[PDB]
């Protein structure tokens, strides 16, 4: 009933494995070299749990480990256990584990345990009691009484916090492996394996495709493979190249590119908006590497956009400087800066209303995120005066970013006009020509020193001061 | 919008059998029958390959498990069977499955995953050319006269679906049957327009002579402000089509405004918003100049709209240049609607674009309130000053509209031209009939 046939998926069929694959073959070792495991006196860990983002193919990993183990594979949806009737789900789990024990050696797979592994006492209904009964039955058949030493359960969940800590107890689910999102090499190999079934070329570089589509799951890479088949018959070329992959990634991350009727002043407004964003971004460290610049409207965004790929390590861990946010707020305010400096103060538009609120929200998050210097951080107080003063610093921070944006955009009028003209004539711009225009008409951008130079100057000042103290002690004493 | 018609046309041009059975046909009381029907339909599709499977209203079986009987278990089992059949479909046999839905939010994201629903097509409401072509198609089925110009009807009925154009032409045919007309005249087509847009005309249902003078004064004042702003400062605002005080549907009076092109509906500048806001207070300007100091409740909604758009100018869009830290959501929400003032220049009026945050400082809230009061008061004095300079045209338009129970934009323009500013009211008062229109359209 719950037994599947034709499980031929192996570890070669799945990419983006990494060191987790080692644990996977450890499971295979648990199914092959277990004689010396129990000879040394090791009870085989029954509970292995894969946790990660959806679409990474956890069930594909289950098929791979089942095929490499060479045992019977059971793949049961957890949604069938919950039902309006009680007792039948417990009997379903009983029959499942009984036929797993009879088919020993075997591995059993249950996906999305969050449906039935919810902590008891969170919902008041008969479905909650049925879920409790099924959880109790699976708990007993896992660890309750003796009789299982050969059947091993593999599970795939998304949210590990929802699970009952009774299930997380060792001997029931003790091995917890996280499947992360694929990095750079992982996306490369997933694209390779999903593209092995189609005729590819020898000049096909996956490095640019992987760097273009950053922070995406393996299902999204399979989708990129799926949009590598449908769109070349419009022109009718010979063999697939990397340009089609780049355009497919561009279509997927934003939407399909649609063209509508448009006047000249509307194009000019979108162009000066995008010029404001890119020109204020290039002079800042965290948003310096602008790679794309287009004003073409897309799905959901009638505006253009500026593409930057900053370092994605400090952002996740939280090591972004205070100046790194005062720069971003200036970037969000700079569309309004260009609008005010070009159309005057009395003719402000409403196209920058989406960035002008991001700037104020970022300032508000900064002032009560402990990053300020009013007393020392201190995002909370007691009396109403300091609570009122909490929101004063955000508005002064917006004001100083606002004047900074005015100064930055006023320094760069010639390159502003040039990039606006190019954006109107070509409707798109890449990194090379935009940076060439920047070098042709740019102003001076004196870079503030990084932390290394500050540490070096502080260290040399400290050494010279301490040796000054040493001589003022020595020659006064000697 | 004819998504089912689109799939039917796809099957007709492709020459393949078309399998139609709606999502509401998959709901039952017994459990497991819907999955059996899914399997039967799928295997009958696999019999005659290639073939197309079409499920109308797929969100009936694919309702999202919202966290805001045994039928729900049947829905989940049917969803599981459908996703199993979709995922297990080899792509080499060419059985394309079509799913038509009305709402993307309630549909489960599992089907949106690649491998089940690879393509997602939006069916936008037809444009001016699209509604033109739908009118050409539907007008070939009924007898048509040469006096009907369908281009104006396609341009003046924005966002109307194909079935709504079908009911337009059908009710035009039934109106011509009622009038015993041999063909569809332009009068009958406009009759269908006013029947489906604002509603049918009542019979003799009128209030007192004071209950109609105030509504007439409000609507005529709004129209006169709009026309004056068009004439003098060349505003980027709409144009008056016709003004009526005949009760239709649930509106005791109505003023009709044309809808402009959407390309001017994106970068709403400060002057455009100020002139539209003056147009909004035109009604209260009319009550204050005509009745002196005894205003009524007929112009309260326009006052609320003006008060909210002043806040939107101040807080949400931040069009002025003291910088503000937060925006506030509208306490009252009125949907964008028909002939009354457009209030959809930026897509809509009462829709903040998630630009709101909870405030902390309560001392700037009063300064925002004072700024809004100053803007509203100054703008009110300007609109009352501009409307009070022309009392003759306003009074003559009110009298003519009261006598005729309906006036046109061209008639309002003629009254404005024939009554220049700063002429005495005695010139209107010496006429043998103030509510007389010597202009013939």
Which residues, in sequence order, are bridge partners of residue B242? B256, B408
| Gap between the Cα atoms of A144 and A141, Å rounded | 6
- B46 exposed, middle or buried (CB, 10 Å; 0-12, 13-18, 19+)? middle
Query: At what resolution in Å was this solved?
Result: 3.3
B267, B269, B344, B368, best to mutate vs chain A, most A CBs in 10 Å: B267
Got the DSSP string for B357-384?
Answer: -----SHHHHHHHHHHHHHHHHHHHHHH
* Tokens 């040469």, residue located: B146
Please, after which residues is chain B broken with C–N above 2.5 Å? 68
Residues 6+ apart with CB under 8 A from A142: A46, A47, A148, A153, A172
- Total number of residues shown for chain A: 478
DSSP class of A180: P
| Gap between the Cα atoms of B431 and B402, Å rounded | 16
| Gap between the Cα atoms of A343 and B139, Å rounded | 48
Please check whether residue A46 is in contact with residue A141, taking contact to mean a CB–CB distance below 8 angstroms: no
Neighbours of A66 (CB within 10 A): 27
* Count of helix runs (H) and strand runs (E) in chain B: 15, 6
The minimum CA-CA distance between B325 and chain A, rounded to whole Å, is 6
* Terminal-to-terminal C-alpha distance of chain B: 37
Spell out a b/e string for A301-319, using b for 16 or more CB atoms within 10 Å of the CB, else e: eebbbbbbeeeeeeeeeee
Query: How far lies A113's CA from each of A77, A80, A163, A171, in Å?
Result: 9, 11, 8, 17
- Give the 3-state secondary structure of residue B20: strand
Angle value at C-alpha A229, between A225 and A232, nearest 5 degrees: 130
**Experimental technique:** cryo-EM
Q: Strands B18-20, B51-56: parallel, antiparallel or unpaired by DSSP?
A: parallel
Give the DSSP H/E element, type plus range, for residue B233: none
Residues 6+ apart with CB under 8 A from B103: B59
Residues 6+ apart with CB under 8 A from B346: A350, B265, B266, B268
Cα A345 to the chain's mean position, in Å?
A: 40
- Is A392 labelled as part of a ligand binding site? no
Query: How far lies A165's CA from each of A161, A169, A303, B106, in Å?
Result: 9, 6, 48, 32
| Gap between the Cα atoms of B19 and B45, Å rounded | 8
Residues 6+ apart with CB under 8 A from B228: B386, B387, B390, B416
Our CA dihedral for A206, A208, A214, A216, rounded to 10 degrees, sits at -30
Q: Strands A290-294, A305-308: parallel, antiparallel or unpaired by DSSP?
A: antiparallel
Got the DSSP string for A327-346?
Answer: HHHHHHHHHHHHHHHHH-ST
Neighbours of A457 (CB within 10 A): 11
| Gap between the Cα atoms of A63 and A56, Å rounded | 13
| Gap between the Cα atoms of A295 and A424, Å rounded | 8
Q: Where are the beta strands (DSSP E) in B6-134?
A: 18-20, 51-56, 95-100
DSSP class of A143: I
Chain A residues 373-432 with a CB less than 8 Å from chain B = 387-388, 390-392, 394-395, 398-399, 402
HSE (side-chain half, CA atoms, 13 Å) at B372: 19
Please confirm, yes or no, whether B219 is among the known catalytic residues.
Answer: yes
Residues 6+ apart with CB under 8 A from A93: A81, A134, A137, A138, A141
| Gap between the Cα atoms of B101 and B58, Å rounded | 6
Residue B265: left (phi > 0), alpha (psi -120 to 50), or beta? alpha
Q: What residues of A are in contact with residue B357 (Cβ under 8 Å)?
A: 360-361, 364
Q: Which of B82, B77, B79, B107 is closest to B97 using CA atoms?
A: B82
Please check whether residue A190 is in contact with residue A218, taking contact to mean a CB–CB distance below 8 angstroms: yes
DSSP class of A449: P
Please check whether residue B132 is in contact with residue B154, taking contact to mean a CB–CB distance below 8 angstroms: yes
**B361·A392 Cβ contact <8 A:** yes
Residue B408: left (phi > 0), alpha (psi -120 to 50), or beta? beta
The strands making up B254-257's β-sheet, listed across from edge to edge, are B254-257, B240-244, B406-408
B340: phi then psi, degrees, rounded to nearest 5:
-55, 170
DSSP class of B19: E
Closest alpha carbon within chain A to B321: A345
Spell out a b/e string for B140-176, using b for 16 or more CB atoms within 10 Å of the CB, else e: eeeebeeebebeebbebbeebebeebbebbebbbebb
Please check whether residue B155 is in contact with residue B128, taking contact to mean a CB–CB distance below 8 angstroms: yes
DSSP class of B107: B
Whether the bond into A41 is cis, omega within 30 of 0: no
Q: Which of B323, B84, B297, B149 is closest to A348 using CA atoms?
A: B323
Q: Which of A274, A421, A433, A439 is catalytic?
A: A274
| Gap between the Cα atoms of B155 and A340, Å rounded | 35
Alpha helices (H) in B179-330, listed in sequence order: 186-197, 209-231, 270-290, 300-311
* Structure token digits, residue B343: 């209030």
The strands making up A152-157's β-sheet, listed across from edge to edge, are A72-77, A106-111, A152-157, A47-51, A175-178
Angle at which helices B300-311 and B363-388 cross, to 10°: 130
| Gap between the Cα atoms of B345 and B264, Å rounded | 8
Closest alpha carbon within chain B to A353: B317
Give the DSSP H/E element, type plus range, for residue A77: strand A72-77
| Gap between the Cα atoms of B404 and B407, Å rounded | 7
Q: Which of B207, B158, B206, B188 is closest to B339 using CA atoms?
A: B158
Give the DSSP H/E element, type plus range, for residue B133: helix B128-139
Which residues, in sequence order, are bridge partners of residue A191? none
Alpha helices (H) in A284-321, listed in sequence order: 314-317
Q: Strands A428-430, B51-56: parallel, antiparallel or unpaired by DSSP?
A: unpaired
DSSP class of B341: -
| Gap between the Cα atoms of A224 and A191, Å rounded | 8
B256: phi then psi, degrees, rounded to nearest 5:
-100, 130
A143: phi then psi, degrees, rounded to nearest 5:
-130, -15
Query: How far lies B327's CA from each of A130, B136, B330, B372, in Å?
Result: 47, 47, 10, 13
Which residues, in sequence order, are bridge partners of residue B256? B242
The minimum CA-CA distance between B49 and chain A, rounded to whole Å, is 21
Residue A466: left (phi > 0), alpha (psi -120 to 50), or beta? alpha
HSE (side-chain half, CA atoms, 13 Å) at A417: 5
| Gap between the Cα atoms of B278 and A267, Å rounded | 29
| Gap between the Cα atoms of A77 and A60, Å rounded | 14
The minimum CA-CA distance between A391 and chain B, rounded to whole Å, is 6
Handedness of CA A228, A234, A236, A242 (dihedral sign): negative
Which residues, in sequence order, are bridge partners of residue A50? A156, A177
* Residue ranges of chain B whose CB lies within 8 Å of a chain A CB: 69-70, 73, 76, 80, 113-115, 118, 263, 266-271, 316-319, 321, 323-327, 346, 353, 355, 357, 359-364
Considering only CB atoms, A357 lies closest to which of B327, B346, B360, namely B327
* Structure token digits, residue A445: 């951008």
Please check whether residue A282 is in contact with residue A288, taking contact to mean a CB–CB distance below 8 angstroms: yes
* Structure token digits, residue B179: 């009038």
Spell out a b/e string for B363-390, using b for 16 or more CB atoms within 10 Å of the CB, else e: ebeeebeebbeebbeebbeebbebbeeb
* Structure token digits, residue A335: 């569309």
| Gap between the Cα atoms of B184 and B145, Å rounded | 6
* Tokens 């000042």, residue located: A461
- B237 exposed, middle or buried (CB, 10 Å; 0-12, 13-18, 19+)? buried
B427: phi then psi, degrees, rounded to nearest 5:
-65, -40
Which residues, in sequence order, are bridge partners of residue A397? none
- Is A55 labelled as part of a ligand binding site? yes
Neighbours of B91 (CB within 10 A): 11
Considering only CB atoms, A219 lies closest to which of B114, B361, B363, namely B114
A224, A353, A400, best to mutate vs chain B, most B CBs in 10 Å: A353
Give the DSSP H/E element, type plus range, for residue A138: helix A126-139
* Tokens 């965004």, residue located: A301
Please check whether residue A249 is in contact with residue A224, taking contact to mean a CB–CB distance below 8 angstroms: yes
- B433 exposed, middle or buried (CB, 10 Å; 0-12, 13-18, 19+)? exposed
Q: Where are the beta strands (DSSP E) in A86-127?
A: 106-111
Residue B419: left (phi > 0), alpha (psi -120 to 50), or beta? beta
Q: Which of B356, B358, B345 is closest to B318 using CA atoms?
A: B356
Chain A residues 49-78 with a CB less than 8 Å from chain B = 55, 77
Q: Which of B269, B261, B277 is closest to B378 using CA atoms?
A: B277
- Is B94 labelled as part of a ligand binding site? no
Q: Which of B420, B89, B273 is closest to B428 using CA atoms?
A: B420
**A348·B325 Cβ contact <8 A:** no
Please check whether residue A337 is in contact with residue A406, taking contact to mean a CB–CB distance below 8 angstroms: yes
Residues 6+ apart with CB under 8 A from B369: none
Our CA dihedral for A365, A370, A371, A376, rounded to 10 degrees, sits at 140
């Amino acid at each position: 009933e719950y037994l599947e046939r034709g499980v031929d998926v192996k570890f070669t069929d799945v990419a983006g494995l990494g060191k987790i694959r080692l644990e996977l073959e450890e499971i295979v070792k648990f199914f092959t070299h277990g004689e010396m495991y129990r000879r040394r006196g090791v009870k085989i860990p029954g509970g292995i749990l894969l946790c990660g983002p959806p679409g990474v193919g956890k069930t594909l990993l289950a098929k791979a480990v089942a095929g490499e183990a060479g045992v019977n594979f059971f793949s049961i949806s957890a949604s069938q256990f919950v039902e309006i009737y009680v007792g039948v789900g417990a009997s379903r789990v009983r029959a499942l584990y009984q036929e797993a024990r009879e088919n020993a050696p075997s591995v059993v797979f249950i996906d999305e345990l969050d449906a039935v592994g919810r902590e008891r006492g969170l919902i008041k209904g008969s479905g909650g009691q049925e879920r409790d009964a099924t959880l109790n039955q699976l708990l007993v058949s896992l660890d309750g009484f003796e009789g299982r030493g050969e059947v091993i359960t593999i599970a795939s969940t998304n949210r590990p916090d929802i699970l009952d800590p009774a299930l997380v107890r060792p001997g029931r689910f003790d091995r917890k492996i996280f499947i992360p999102k694929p990095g750079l090499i992982g996306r490369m190999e997933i694209l390779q394996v999903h593209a092995r079934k189609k005729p590819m070329a020898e000049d096909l570089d996956y490095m640019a495709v992987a760097s273009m589509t950053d922070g995406m799951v393996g299902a999204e890479l399979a989708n990129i493979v799926e949009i590598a088949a449908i769109n070349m018959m419009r022109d009718g070329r010979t063999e697939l190249t990397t340009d089609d992959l780049l355009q497919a990634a561009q279509i997927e991350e934003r939407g399909m590119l649609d063209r509508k009727d448009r006047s000249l002043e509307t194009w000019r407004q979108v162009a000066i908006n995008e010029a404001a964003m890119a020109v204020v971004a290039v002079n800042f460290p965290d948003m310096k590497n602008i790679e794309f610049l287009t004003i073409n409207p897309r799905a959901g965004r009638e505006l253009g956009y500026v593409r930057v790929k900053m370092d994605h390590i400090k952002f996740k861990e939280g090591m972004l400087s205070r100046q790194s946010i005062l720069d971003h707020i200036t970037v969000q305010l700079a569309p309004r800066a260009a609008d005010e400096l070009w159309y005057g103060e009395d003719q402000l538009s409403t196209i920058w209303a989406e960035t002008s609120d991001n700037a104020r929200s970022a300032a508000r998050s900064l002032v009560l995120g402990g990053l300020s210097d009013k007393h020392h951080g201190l995002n909370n107080f007691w009396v109403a005066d300091r609570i009122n003063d909490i929101d004063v610093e955000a508005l002064r921070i917006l004001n100083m970013c606002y004047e900074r944006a005015k100064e930055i955009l006023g320094r760069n009028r010639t390159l502003m006009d040039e990039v606006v003209e190019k954006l109107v004539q070509k409707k798109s711009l890449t990194k090379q020509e935009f940076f060439t225009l920047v070098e042709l008409y740019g102003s001076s951008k004196p870079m503030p020193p990084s932390i290394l130079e500050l540490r070096k100057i502080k260290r040399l000042e400290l050494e010279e001061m301490v040796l000054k103290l040493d001589m003022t002690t020595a020659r006064n004493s000697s | 919008c004819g998504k089912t018609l689109v799939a039917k046309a796809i099957a007709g041009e492709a020459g393949v059998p078309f399998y139609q059975m709606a999502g509401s046909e998959f709901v039952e009381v017994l459990v497991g029958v819907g999955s059996a029907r899914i399997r039967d339909l799928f295997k009958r599709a696999k019999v005659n390959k290639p073939s197309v499977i079409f499920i109308d209203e797929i969100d009936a079986l694919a309702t999202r498990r919202q966290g805001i009987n045994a039928a729900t278990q049947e829905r989940e089992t049917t969803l599981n069977q459908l996703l199993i059949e979709l995922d297990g479909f080899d792509t080499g046999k060419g059985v394309i499955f079509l799913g038509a839905t009305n709402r993307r939010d309630l549909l489960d994201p599992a089907l949106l995953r690649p491998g089940r629903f690879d393509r997602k097509i939006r069916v936008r409401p037809p444009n001016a050319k699209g509604r033109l072509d739908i009118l050409k198609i539907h007008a070939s089925k009924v007898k048509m006269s040469d006096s009907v110009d369908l281009s104006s009807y396609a341009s003046n009925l924005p966002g109307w679906s194909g079935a709504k154009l079908a009911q337009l032409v059908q009710e035009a045919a039934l109106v011509a049957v009622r009038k015993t007309h041999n063909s569809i005249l332009q009068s009958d087509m406009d009759d269908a327009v006013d029947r489906l847009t604002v509603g049918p005309t009542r019979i003799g249902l009128e209030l007192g002579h004071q209950g109609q003078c105030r509504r007439a004064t409000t609507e005529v004042g709004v129209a006169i402000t709009s026309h004056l702003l068009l004439r003098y400062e060349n505003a980027k605002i709409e144009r008056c089509d016709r003004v009526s005080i005949i009760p239709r549907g649930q509106t005791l009076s109505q003023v009709v405004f044309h809808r402009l092109d959407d390309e001017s509906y994106m970068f709403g500048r400060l002057p455009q918003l100020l002139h539209r806001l003056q147009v909004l207070l035109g009604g209260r300007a009319a009550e204050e100049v005509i009745y002196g100091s005894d205003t009524s409740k007929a112009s309260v909604d326009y006052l609320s709209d003006a008060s909210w758009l002043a806040r939107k100018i101040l807080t949400i869009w931040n069009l002025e240049n003291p910088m503000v830290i937060h925006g506030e959501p509208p306490p009252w929400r009125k949907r964008p609607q028909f002939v009354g003032p457009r209030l959809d220049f930026e897509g809509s009026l009462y829709d903040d674009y998630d630009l709101v945050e909870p405030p902390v400082n309560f001392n700037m809230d009063d300064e925002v309130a004072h700024r809004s009061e100053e803007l509203i008061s100054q703008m009110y004095n300007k609109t009352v000053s501009l409307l009070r300079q022309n009392q003759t045209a306003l009074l003559k338009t009110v009298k003519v509209l009261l006598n005729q129970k309906e006036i046109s934009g061209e008639a309002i323009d003629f009254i404005l031209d024939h009554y220049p500013p700063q002429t005495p009211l005695n010139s209107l008062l010496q006429e043998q009939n103030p509510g007389s229109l010597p202009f013939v359209p």
